[PDB]
């Protein structure tokens, strides 16, 4: 269960 972040990309 990951999620896209404005920091770079999908992060979980």
10: left (phi over 0), alpha (psi -120 to 50) or beta: beta
Q: Which two tokens stand for residue 8?
A: 């770079």
Q: Which two tokens stand for residue 10?
A: 């999908």
Cβ 11 vs Cβ 1: under 8 Å: no
As a whole number of angstroms, the distance between CA 6 and CA 12 comes to 13
11, 3 contact by CB (below 8 A): yes
User: CB neighbours of 12 closer than 8 A, spacing ≥ 6?
Assistant: 1, 2, 3
How many helices and strands, by DSSP H and E, does the chain display?
0, 2
Q: Obtained via which technique?
A: NMR
């Amino acid at each position: 269960a990951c999620f896209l972040t404005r920091l770079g990309t999908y992060v979980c």
